[PDB]
Design a protein around this ligand. Structure first.
Ligand SMILES: O=c1ccn([C@H]2C[C@H](O)[C@@H](COP(=O)(O)O)O2)c(=O)[nH]1
Ligand SMILES: O=c1ccn([C@H]2C[C@H](O)[C@@H](COP(=O)(O)O)O2)c(=O)[nH]1
Lengths: 285, 283
């Protein structure tokens, strides 16, 4: 069966037996707790096809994370605007972080990944050598101790929550090496099935391809584990539309160049081959 | 179907198609990566039955960590010895932490749960108002903002790993409130299917029972998520024997009095009703 059907089945399960609860946004959601799906990376790339996924966003955001940035202006410069609402001086003021310059998200993914446990100053500070560099950590383990059971990168630092524009949803990833293949499991505490989850599958699938490339391994599987998997009430009509669509065969992902380091990737290094999605489905928020 | 059949099926899959790997110290496991099982908490308590689980150890260990202890002696004094090897001066010297007094495990679970991000000194220090109290954090959310999607308690602090006797296996738990019920998902990065996992299921199921009690909710589901799920090769034969056993009905768990704080439970507050496991197996 087409692997996209897991996601579509999860949509149906939530619609059909999800709990109706008033959430933070006050829009209301239907939700289930605890889900898991499995996506092969060996012969294709799991970029969902029953709607067009914002691939350009997926690529730029991950490279932005990987270099340790916490500056939304830095992502915005590449034309990807998805963090700009959260980086505005207005939004930050609303969070009780009015002292921040425009763009300073606080110690979000980039900072946690490259400097876990360091004291955050601002987005312009030099954090060289400060905190625990989890990216170096996992690459070293994958290369030199591939069967280790602690190949983890974690973004959840509760001591840093009050400094963050938003608390992370992707709590950690774990990697696993067997038979020359690299696999990845993501624990995501909160998944907006409508706008978030297809994008998120793509992000960590991409990360796995990049790590596999850099470490001389082939991509294996991506395992997506969800906590609160939910559908916003405002998404019920477009998602019912999406549920009428049959998945197309997944595309392939090609890396166009030998890249020696996780930090040396650029968007021009990737080629998506035969991505043929159904049309974009607009959904509110 | 009996929910323990999930665990037994997981055992079977690993023995059938698990990957055969040696670590950098030369020991072999069969493993699979990425697993998930669900245990109902409503009508019974999921203490596994095809081999006896060390319930007395499960209870004392959890109470010990909830009060923020990183002192193995405090656990040992209760008659539960499962952390004593790790807290021995020889073990800590083997870890590169020979300065430690006997019992000082470093910033393991107790410290991460009650003082995340604080600077660890030693097991005897007073850390009041230091770091992030995740236990108070999640109790407050469950009570006052039950639909919050950030009800997290995390034990994985990479900056602290070098100070710990052993890195945590149970990286985080998340809680969920729906229709008067409290559910819990554990992310476990590494599960010894033979010796560890049944104990681990009991631990977080009990934790959910306690939090539900304190917050006036009913226990719902425990979702167990595994990363590296493995069987040590030396365990394969006794596990083949265990796999011939039919699960017996799960016991029930009763809490004997009204307890209003997660820190006020004692082992006497818990009655395990009709736990009839098959005999323990020598692994
Ligand atoms: O990468 C992301 C980021 C956000 N969200 C969604 C999930 C929630 O609907 C919302 C975040 O809200 P909280 O869970 O923090 O309340 O955004 C995702 O699905 N994926
Ligand atoms: O609560 C625990 C603690 C440990 N283990 C097992 C898993 C591994 O076999 C071993 C820990 O070794 P590492 O994964 O840290 O290498 O102990 C468990 O199953 N449960």
């Amino acid at each position: 069966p087409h692997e996209e059907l897991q996601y579509l089945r999860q949509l149906r399960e939530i619609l059909c037996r999800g709990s109706d609860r008033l959430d933070r946004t006050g829009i209301g959601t239907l939700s289930l707790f605890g889900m898991q799906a499995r996506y092969s990376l060996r012969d294709h790339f799991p970029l969902l096809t029953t709607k067009r996924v914002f691939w350009r966003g997926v690529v730029q955001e991950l490279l932005w994370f990987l270099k340790g940035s916490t500056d939304s202006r830095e992502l915005s410069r590449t034309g990807v605007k998805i963090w700009d609402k959260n980086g505005s001086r207005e939004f930050l003021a609303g969070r009780g972080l009015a002292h921040r310059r425009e763009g300073d998200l606080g110690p979000v993914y980039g900072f946690q990944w490259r400097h876990f446990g360091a004291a955050y100053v601002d987005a312009d500070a030099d954090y060289t050598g400060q905190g625990f560099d989890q990216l170096s950590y996992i690459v070293d383990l994958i290369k030199n101790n591939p069967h280790d059971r602690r190949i983890i990168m974690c973004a959840w630092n509760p001591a840093d929550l009050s400094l963050m524009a938003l608390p992370p949803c992707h709590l950690l990833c774990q990697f696993y090496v067997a038979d020359g293949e690299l696999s990845c499991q993501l624990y995501q505490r909160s998944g907006d099935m409508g706008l978030g989850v297809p994008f998120n599958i793509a992000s960590y699938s991409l990360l796995t391809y990049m790590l596999a490339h850099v470490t001389g391994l082939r991509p294996g599987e991506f395992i997506h584990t969800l906590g609160d998997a939910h559908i916003y009430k405002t998404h019920i009509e477009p998602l019912r539309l999406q549920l009428t669509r049959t998945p197309r065969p997944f595309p392939r992902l090609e890396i166009l160049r030998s890249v020696s380091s996780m930090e040396e990737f650029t968007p021009d290094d990737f080629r998506l081959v035969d991505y043929c999605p159904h049309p974009t489905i607009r959904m509110e928020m």
